[PDB]
Amino acid sequence: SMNPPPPETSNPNKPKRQTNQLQYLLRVVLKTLWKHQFAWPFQQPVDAVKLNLPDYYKIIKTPMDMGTIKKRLENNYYWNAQECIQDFNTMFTNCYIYNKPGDDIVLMAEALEKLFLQKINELPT
Numbered sequence: 031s032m033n034p035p036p037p038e039t040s041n042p043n044k045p046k047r048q049t050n051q052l053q054y055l056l057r058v059v060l061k062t063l064w065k066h067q068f069a070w071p072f073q074q075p076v077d078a079v080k081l082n083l084p085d086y087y088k089i090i091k092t093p094m095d096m097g098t099i100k101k102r103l104e105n106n107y108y109w110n111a112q113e114c115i116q117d118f119n120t121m122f123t124n125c126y127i128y129n130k131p132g133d134d135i136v137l138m139a140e141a142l143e144k145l146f147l148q149k150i151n152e153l154p155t
């Protein structure tokens with residue numbers, strides 16, 4: 031099959047936590063980025079079959095997307111904010127790795143990453 035199984039959104043072995051900052055990442059950061067005009071490519075795992083990108087997972091080995099992150103946050107999958115933020119960053123870097131500078135999808139990611147940075151610049155205490 032061209033698509034791998036999607037990243038886990040739960041894990042019984044992994045310890046959960048809820049924090050003010052993780053709460054913020056879901057209610058404010060994720061759910062605001064979600065509403066951006068450029069959010070749609072990043073709202074679900076890359077479907078290599080659907081998007082006709084047969085080489086995507088030959089290149090990207092740590093896929094990540096906001097749909098996954100959203101479910102992780104809802105499941106309280108994360109231990110801390112940093113874990114969630116590194117997922118966001120993985121998603122953006124994946125886009126820059128797979129695509130070329132100037133590509134439309136890259137312009138989109140660049141715009142979201144800027145907004146993402148603006149919102150995590152200050153987190154609740």
Ligand SMILES: Cc1ccc2c(c1)NC(=O)[C@@H](C)O2
Binds near residue numbers: 071072125128129135
């Ligand atoms: C055609 C197409 C649609 C959506 C897309 C892409 C390519 N390329 C990507 O890297 C992902 C994240 O988003």
